[PDB]
Write a protein that binds this DNA or RNA. Structure first.
Ligand code: MG
Ligand code: MG
Ligand code: MG
Ligand code: MG
Ligand code: MG
Ligand code: MG
Ligand code: MG
Ligand code: MG
Ligand code: MG
Ligand code: MG
Ligand code: MG
Ligand code: MG
Ligand code: MG
Ligand code: MG
Ligand code: MG
Ligand code: MG
Ligand code: MG
Ligand code: MG
Ligand code: MG
Lengths: 203, 34, 125, 142, 137, 87, 92, 91
RNA sequence: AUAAUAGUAAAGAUGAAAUAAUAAUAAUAAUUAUAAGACUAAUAUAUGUGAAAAUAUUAAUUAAAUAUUAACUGACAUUGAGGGAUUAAAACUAGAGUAGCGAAACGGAUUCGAUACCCGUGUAGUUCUAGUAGUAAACUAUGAAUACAAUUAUUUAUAAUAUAUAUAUAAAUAAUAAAUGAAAAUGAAAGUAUUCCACCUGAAGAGUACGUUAGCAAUAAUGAAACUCAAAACAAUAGACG
């Protein structure tokens, strides 16, 4: 029947939620399903939703809550930043392992809690990564110090041998401007779904 | 009744009240003993 | 009929403040039991300062000792107890208030209910 | 004994006139504990300089105005400075939200109340209101 | 009456229950007696509200009038139930003269009673007459 | 939370739309100079450059440099944004 | 006496009302502004102004209703304009 | 050096975005910002001024349901409890 | 309001001024300390609750009150002439009470005049207890009851859901469809229908006179005619005007 087709179809596939698109609180993982178009479909304003989406939007990705509202507008936000964070994490290549002595959940009524990682990493911890220069022991990643350090779409705890005064005290609260290199030690994941990275400042 | 129409009625009522006030002693005289 | 009470007693003596309170509690409890009543709990509260300088007849008070007595009685009994409280010189403010027993039989004091414990069984345990 | 603990600057700022008042909180160093504590709580006051903006030669209507109040405040401050009640701390209080209240605070802020400010420990309003009470006059037609 | 209890309790039953509890405890004196006394005081009519007493009176009336165990709504039993309330309402009014809302309520209640007795008379006259005689009307 | 739906209105418009432009540079400099002169006596050379800067600012005119489309949008989108029931 | 001495004006701080603030010596003006704000929040000047004259109880009730309505309209307007702003931002 | 109001401190475990460093983010954050709400009748707290004083202005006035943000019934119960409190000495 | 403290020449009022139980007999402001009445800030939306008048400081007593289930009664219902009871404010009769307010009265202003609007003294009255009386724009200017009809958004309560979700119910409130309507607009009624009661039949004269009944009274109800007009009224329209 039609009903069966509807149940199958791509709008039914997007699991509904009425969480805020603007959430100024702490964001530990994606809230909403990111939805992309193709360039062609964007050109004729079609996203595979109830209505056309405004020609002002030139980004291919978005997030939404309601197909149509009482205000006669779809409730959306044109941004898909969460995919890029995931891709950055993948690039960094630091495999998430549970610091607590437990089996990997992907191997072997309902539990709504996050099964291992939320699916930002299905990488396994045992691999090395060779290159022309050699086998990479230390993962080199550029990040920004805030005061904690922003390292490729994630905030991370930082440690060092000696606190460098020349770089820090010259610009005390404009440290965000200057990008510093980092050596990421390991990535643990807590119950709330926050990725607790740990980096080391290189100079 | 609009307010304008009411005002005629009000005026009439006032006139009546005045008449009653005037004819108090006369009314008293008429009432007692007959 | 379960009636809660809140009496804010006088504390004249500096070193031994609770004595007057204790005497009051004894007397009113005695009255209750003589008059078919059943005192369930006598919750003490601290030597708490009053919000304003509250005054009885030809006296003034800034600090008092507070307590709840959670007793059963008749209505007439309760009323008379209230009157006796109003009369006496060693209490600043008194307040009896009913605790409704249409649903339950065991009911703790208002403070205990606010904390969490609905019945006195919970408090016991 | 008579020890001055602190001074209190009172300012009643009505529609038609201001009343500035300076007064010393006079504690005696020299019975029941409760009574002593009560005495400590409400220390007796003695008035030192009373002032109303007609005292500064503002007659009838001008005394309800802003400049007049400011002048009165300045005069008060001068009196405080000269008569020598600046050794202990000061406590500002107000009433009735007139124009003159606005003047007084501005005067205190500025150079006219320069010497006083440094002793002013607390500002604390005490306007009187009624929770029902006596019925007010009928609202004038005009 | 002296050992009558509120909350739908019966004194004989309560004592028996207490004894059974004691026996169970033994299996698994002065103090116990004091506790029992406290319980009785709590559940006594004379410490409880008037509402409980009224309810008891209504139940008694129902028991008296019910033409079979289940009956609630027999025109006669309805009238009997009304009567107890009326009596109590009348007593309240006698205490409180100017309580006009509750006088109105009383009035309505006796009008309702009259109406149901009128109905009973039409339906089943002898029964109606018997009911009247019982109620003192 | 408590939502508040308006009735049908003739025209949604803000009576006066504020732009919220930045304060003038010359005025700021003048205020700074005033503040400096409150301290340091009348005219000491701590505020020697500030006065010069003020003069430079206020040479051609007393102020240096000399609207928000919000009503047009409200007017445009009122009929959409209404929860007005059908015709 | 000794006990009174030990109680170093402990009650004096808690007994006083909320219409009172400790002045910072660096900025009396700031303190005054804060006090004024507090007074505004408590609606004390407006209450005082209301209390100067008597207003018939039905008339004051009507006024109160009108004020409430005005309030509710304003937040309805605010809600509407926020939606309008969102629409503008998005493209609608 | 710079003040705290013009720099968003991203928490430790959180994700961020290029936008999140901006002025506009900070403005957005600024724009967008209990036992009685938990589900217990406030008329238990009439001998607990400490807790009832939270639902009261500095002077002593009770706060409006727009401010306190309660269920209407629950708000009225709270108000009742407060009034009971001030009838007694305590509060 | 009285008294005390210390303190100094004005205070209070208004559009601006004066008169007054204001003040050089030492006030006003301030701080205390007594007393007296009457009112009830926030919460508050009269939301809700009450038959309507009404009704928001606290407590207690007695009365009445909601929903859903279970059982019972078996049309016992609806409306309601006459009748009955309650019925704001003012008013009246007793006996208390009397702070504040405040008809009247007197005085000061304002004004050509000012029997006013503003200010000052301020008596009845407002307050309580016991009554009388039974009217108000007593208004939703809309009598009560039942069956029914298209949507949406808000809350409120009920049930299930696997306590916090998205669902089914009701209830109210706000926008409407249809329909009705002189239109304004009404919107589950001012719609579609059925039942019962009250009331209207041009304007003036008139809710007047006479009569009767009731009231301590003011008054309340009942309620005509002659005489005289072709008027009189409502919704909306466009102006002019403020
Ligand atoms: Mg008509
Ligand atoms: Mg007056
Ligand atoms: Mg009937
Ligand atoms: Mg009705
Ligand atoms: Mg109120
Ligand atoms: Mg009224
Ligand atoms: Mg009267
Ligand atoms: Mg009299
Ligand atoms: Mg007058
Ligand atoms: Mg009567
Ligand atoms: Mg009449
Ligand atoms: Mg009538
Ligand atoms: Mg009315
Ligand atoms: Mg239509
Ligand atoms: Mg029709
Ligand atoms: Mg018609
Ligand atoms: Mg309508
Ligand atoms: Mg006749
Ligand atoms: Mg008549």
């Amino acid at each position: 029947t039609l009903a069966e087709l509807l149940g199958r179809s791509r709008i039914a596939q997007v699991a509904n939620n009425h969480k805020p698109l603007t959430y100024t609180g702490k964001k530990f993982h994606p809230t909403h399903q990111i939805i992309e178009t193709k360039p062609s479909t964007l050109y004729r304003q079609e996203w595979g939703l109830k209505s056309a989406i405004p020609s002002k939007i030139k980004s291919r990705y978005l997030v939404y809550n309601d197909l149509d509202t009482l205000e006669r507008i779809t409730t959306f936000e044109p941004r898909g930043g969460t995919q890029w964070n995931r891709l950055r994490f993948q690039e960094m290549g630091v495999p998430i392992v549970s610091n607590i002595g437990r089996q990997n959940p992907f191997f072997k009524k309902f539990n709504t809690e996050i099964i291992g990682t939320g699916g930002l990493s299905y990488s396994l911890p045992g691999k090395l990564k060779n290159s022309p220069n050699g086998v990479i022991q230390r993962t080199v990643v550029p990040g920004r110090i805030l005061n904690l350090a922003a390292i490729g779409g994630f905030v991370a705890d930082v440690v060092f041998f000696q606190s460098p005064p020349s770089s820090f005290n010259s610009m005390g609260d404009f440290i965000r401007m200057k990008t510093f290199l980092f050596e990421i030690l390991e990535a643990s994941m807590e119950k709330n779904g926050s990725v607790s990275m740990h980096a080391r400042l290189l100079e | 009744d609009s307010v304008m129409r009411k005002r005629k009625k009000k005026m009439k009522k006032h006139k009546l009240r005045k008449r009653r006030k005037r004819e108090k002693a006369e009314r008293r005289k008429l009432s007692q003993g007959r | 009929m379960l009636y809660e009470l809140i009496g804010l007693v006088r504390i004249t003596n500096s070193n031994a403040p609770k004595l007057e309170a204790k005497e009051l509690s004894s007397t009113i409890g005695k009255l209750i039991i003589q008059n078919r009543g059943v005192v369930r709990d006598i919750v003490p509260m601290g030597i708490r300062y009053l919000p304003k300088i509250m005054k009885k007849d030809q006296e003034k008070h800034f600090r008092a000792y507070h307590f709840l007595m959670l007793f059963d009685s008749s209505a007439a009994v309760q009323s008379e107890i209230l009157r006796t409280l109003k009369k006496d010189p060693r209490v600043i403010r008194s307040s009896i208030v009913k605790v409704d027993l249409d649903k339950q039989l065991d009911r703790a004091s208002s403070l205990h209910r606010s904390l969490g414990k609905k019945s006195i069984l919970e408090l016991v345990n | 004994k008579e020890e001055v603990v602190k001074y209190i600057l009172h300012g009643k700022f009505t529609k038609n006139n201001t009343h500035l008042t300076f007064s010393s909180v006079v504690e005696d160093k020299n019975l029941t504990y409760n009574d002593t504590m009560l005495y400590y709580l409400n220390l007796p006051q003695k008035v030192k300089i009373s002032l109303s903006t007609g005292c500064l030669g503002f007659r009838k209507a001008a005394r309800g105005e802003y400049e007049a109040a400011f002048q009165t405040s300045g005069r008060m401050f001068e009196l405080i400075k000269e008569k020598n009640m600046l050794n202990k701390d000061i406590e500002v209080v107000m009433d009735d939200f007139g124009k003159g209240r606005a003047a007084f605070i501005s005067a205190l802020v500025g150079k006219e109340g320069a010497s006083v400010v440094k002793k002013v420990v607390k500002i604390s309003d005490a306007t009187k209101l009624k929770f029902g009470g006596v019925r007010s006059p009928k609202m004038r037609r005009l | 009456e002296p050992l009558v209890l509120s909350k739908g309790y019966n004194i004989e039953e309560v004592d028996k229950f207490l004894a059974a509890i004691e026996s169970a405890k033994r299996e698994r004196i002065e103090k116990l007696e004091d506790r029992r006394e406290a319980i009785l005081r709590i559940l006594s009519m004379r410490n409880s509200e008037n509402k409980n007493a009224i309810k008891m009176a209504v139940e008694l009336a129902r028991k008296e009038f019910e033409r079979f165990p289940g009956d609630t709504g027999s025109s006669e039993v309805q009238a009997a139930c009304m009567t107890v309330r009326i009596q109590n309402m009348a007593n309240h009014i006698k205490e409180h003269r100017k309580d006009f809302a509750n006088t109105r309520n009383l009035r309505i209640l006796v009008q309702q009673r009259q109406a149901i007795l009128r109905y009973l008379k039409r339906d089943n006259p002898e029964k109606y007459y018997w009911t009247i005689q019982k109620l003192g009307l | 939370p408590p939502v508040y739906r308006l009735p049908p209105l003739p025209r949604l418009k803000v009576k006066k739309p504020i732009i919220r432009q930045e304060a003038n540079k010359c005025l700021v400099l003048m205020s700074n100079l005033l503040q400096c002169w409150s301290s340091y006596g009348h005219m000491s050379p701590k505020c020697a450059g500030l006065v010069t800067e003020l003069k430079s600012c206020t040479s051609e005119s007393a102020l240096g440099k000399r609207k928000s489309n919000i009503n047009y949008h409200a007017a445009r989108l009122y009929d959409r944004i209404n929860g007005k029931p059908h015709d | 006496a000794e006990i009174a001495r030990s109680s170093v004006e402990n009650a004096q701080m808690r007994f006083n009302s909320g219409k009172s603030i400790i002045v910072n010596k660096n900025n009396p003006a700031e303190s005054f502004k804060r006090l004024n704000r507090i007074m505004f929040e408590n609606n004390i000047p407006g209450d005082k102004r209301s209390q100067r004259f008597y207003m018939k109880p039905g008339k004051v009730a009507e006024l109160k209703r009108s004020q409430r309505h005005r309030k509710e309209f304003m937040m309805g307007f605010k809600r509407l304009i926020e939606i309008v702003k969102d629409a503008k931002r998005k493209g609608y | 050096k710079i003040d705290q109001s013009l720099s968003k401190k991203l928490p430790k475990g959180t994700i961020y975005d290029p936008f999140d460093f901006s002025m506009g983010r900070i403005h957005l954050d600024r724009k967008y910002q209990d036992i009685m709400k938990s589900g217990a009748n406030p008329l238990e707290f009439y001998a607990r001024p400490r807790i009832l004083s939270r639902y009261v202005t500095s002077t002593g006035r009770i706060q409006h349901r727009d401010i306190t943000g309660l269920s209407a019934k629950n708000q009225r119960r709270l108000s009742k409890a407060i009034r009971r409190c001030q009838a007694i000495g305590l509060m």
